[PDB]
Structures are given as C-alpha cells and as structure tokens.
C-alpha cells in the first residue's frame, strides 16, 4: 500500500497550517486508498455492490470529518486510525441498511387482508423468520 511515513509528514504539515483551511490532496488520496482497500476485507466485500459503495462513501466522509482530531505528539501511526474510522462508519451503514430491509418485511407480514382464500405457508412463514432474525438486536 501507500507508505506510512509520508502520511506523517503530510498530516503534520496540515496540522501546522490549521494553527493559522483545507487538507492536502495527498492525504485525501491516501484516505481513499485505505478505505477502498479495507473494503476488500474478508468480513466485508461479501454481499453486494449496491451497499458497498455507500459504505465506502460513508467511511470516507467519516474519516475526513474525524481527522480534525489526530494527536501528533503521540501515536505516530495513522494507518490504524483511518482504518478504525472507516470500520465504524461501515458497520453503522450495514446496520441502517439491514434495518430498512427488516422494515420491508415487517410491513409485509402484517397484511393478511387481501382478496380471497388459499394463502401460502412457506413464502409467508419465511419472511417472518427473517423479520425476527435481525430483531435479536
């Protein structure tokens, strides 16, 4: 990946500038690289490209917002810092999406008022099972 040393210099420079407002684009590219890299982890990169892009954009916005608070005199590795930020934003996004899906289910399983007879069992007593499965939270 991108070097760990140059990021130190770039962030020190931007922090000194903050003591006078915008980040150098080098550190922005570095953040994008590390976010998109973590996107290819094994626990992620497993389900769908419709969510994954939203997770990555969210994590990038989160890390950019949060780089405001990086201690420069101690903890000289920001690799783990940005990793943790994007990780947290990832998991928040995954929660929101899963609960929106559960909303769809829970609206479904509460509608036995239709036309007429012979309603199913599997196709209806399976959405319930997913409708409860994430409700363990």
């Amino acid at each position: 990946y991108v070097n760990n040393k140059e990021l130190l210099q770039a962030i020190i420079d931007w922090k000194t500038e903050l003591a006078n407002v915008r980040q150098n684009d080098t550190i922005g590219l570095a953040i994008m690289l590390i976010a998109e890299g973590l996107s290819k982890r094994f626990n992620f990169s497993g389900y769908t490209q419709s969510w994954k892009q939203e997770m990555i954009a969210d994590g990038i916005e989160a890390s950019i917002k949060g780089l405001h608070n990086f201690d420069e005199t101690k903890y000289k590795n920001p690799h783990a810092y940005i990793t943790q930020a994007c990780f947290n934003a990832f998991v928040q996004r995954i929660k929101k999406e899963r609960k929106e899906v559960a909303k769809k289910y829970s609206y479904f399983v509460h509608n036995v008022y239709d036309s007429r007879d012979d309603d199913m069992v599997a196709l209806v007593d399976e959405t319930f099972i997913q409708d409860i499965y994430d409700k363990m939270t």
């Binding site: 990038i60 769809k104 199913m120």
Partner: protein
C-alpha cells in the same frame, strides 16, 4: 411492497431513489467540510453514476444487481422489452367477464352454436341475472339476489336460459394466427365442464382434441352484440380472406 397476494414484490425503484438522495445529501455536507477536491470530485463522479443507473441502467458499463445477480429494473426498463407498459399493458391487457376451458365435439350442434357449461355461464352473466331478479321483484337488496343465486334455487335457471337467448359469446384459441382464430356463437347450456364445438369450425381454429383449451368472452353493450352477430358470427366467415377458397371443408 406491492402486495398482490402470495409472494411479495419489491418495487425496486425505491431503492435506487434512496441511493441518489443519499449521495446527494452527502455531497452537500462536504460543501460544509471543504474536503480535498479529489474527494469532492470522487463524490460528484459517484452522483453522476447513480443518477445514470437510476434513469437507464445497463447503458453504463456494468449494471448493478440487488440480489440473485439479477440486474434491478431501472426506470426506463419499465418501457422497453416485452414487458414495458407498451407490449404488456397498453396493447394486451387482461379482461373481466371471461373464462377458459377444455373443448369437445358435440356433433349434434348446428353451425351457429356452441356448448357452454352451466357453471361457467352462471358465473359470467351474473350481473344480468341480478338485474332480472331485481326487475321481477324476487328480491330487494343486492345481497338478497347474491344469496339466491348462491343457493342455485330452481328459479335462476329459467332466468339464465332466458338471458342467454340471443347473447353471443366470443370463442378464442391461444395462438391467434389469422382472422379466423376468434369467432362468435350463441351458446346452449350443457351439463359438464367442457365446451362443445362444431366439428366443421375446428379448421379455422386449427384445434385438435388432444386437450386444447379455449377462452370465452362476453360482449356487453348493444353495439358489441350487433357486431358479433353481424360480423364475427360463425355463419358469416366461410371464405378465408387470404384466398376466396372455402374454409368449411369437411375434414
């Protein structure tokens, strides 16, 4: 969720819309963060890509799939294909007052009549029956008439074989190749669940009797009855409009 019984659908447009707004919102907030313009650029790129995939997916390089790897249906794909509004709901739509059955011969029929099982005929002409009942006064409310019809009392059958008297039906087969795949008739009631069909007309329909099926429609207004009686009757179409050769050849 559309909720047309049974399986539940998704109405996937929602999904797409959300993402757009999502990214749009995100963009605005970066305009309150003054990010590296590389990231603002990447976000603008994502926004363009999302609006595109919403308007007409697949036109850009890769189409996005929700699950089962089946590319989700963008907005435009509600108009293209065999399944847009055009080839699915504006030209050919499903219709009320209609039925379907298997067909049989009845070589005792004349040429301008066909069999029509009592059950089906009772189901199709229902509002006519309610009208005649509430005319004769054999009931007061609509539900009275419905229960009466439901108990199949001995009075409904005379009402039925009265209304049928000159009320033509339109019979049709599945692949309607040429003009003679849909023809009018005057039905006679039958004790069964199958449609009788005059053995001479099974050439226009190209209908064997290996278990073919047919559909029955019912004209309503005066004009439709007059047209079915004067134009599409089985005793007006004996000359194939392709070439004036007769089409009622005993087979």
């Amino acid at each position: 969720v559309p909720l047309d019984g049974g399986r539940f659908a998704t109405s996937d447009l929602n999904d797409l819309y959300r993402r757009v707004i999502n990214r749009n919102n995100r963009l605005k907030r970066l305009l309150d963060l003054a990010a590296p313009d590389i990231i603002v650029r990447n976000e603008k790129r994502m926004l363009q890509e999302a609006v595109d995939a919403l308007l007409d997916n697949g036109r850009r390089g890769r189409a996005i799939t929700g699950s089962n790897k089946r590319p989700l249906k963008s907005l435009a794909d509600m108009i293209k294909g065999k399944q847009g509004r055009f080839r699915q709901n504006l030209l050919g739509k499903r219709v009320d007052y209609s039925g379907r059955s298997v067909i049989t011969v009845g070589p005792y029929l004349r040429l301008h009549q066909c069999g029509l099982p009592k059950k089906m005929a009772l189901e199709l002409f229902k509002p006519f029956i309610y009208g005649k009942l509430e005319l004769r006064g054999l009931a007061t409310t609509i539900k009275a008439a419905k229960k009466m019809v439901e108990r199949e009392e001995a009075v409904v059958w005379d009402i039925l074989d009265e209304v049928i008297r000159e009320h033509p039906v339109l019979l049709n087969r599945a692949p309607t190749l040429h003009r003679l795949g849909i023809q009018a008739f005057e039905p006679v009631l039958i004790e069964g669940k199958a449609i009788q069909l005059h053995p001479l007309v099974c050439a226009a329909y190209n209908a064997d009797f290996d278990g073919d099926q047919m559909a029955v429609h019912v004209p309503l207004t005066l004009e439709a009855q007059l047209e079915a009686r004067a134009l599409m009757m089985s005793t007006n179409n004996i000359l194939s409009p392709a070439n004036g050769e007769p089409i009622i050849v005993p087979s």
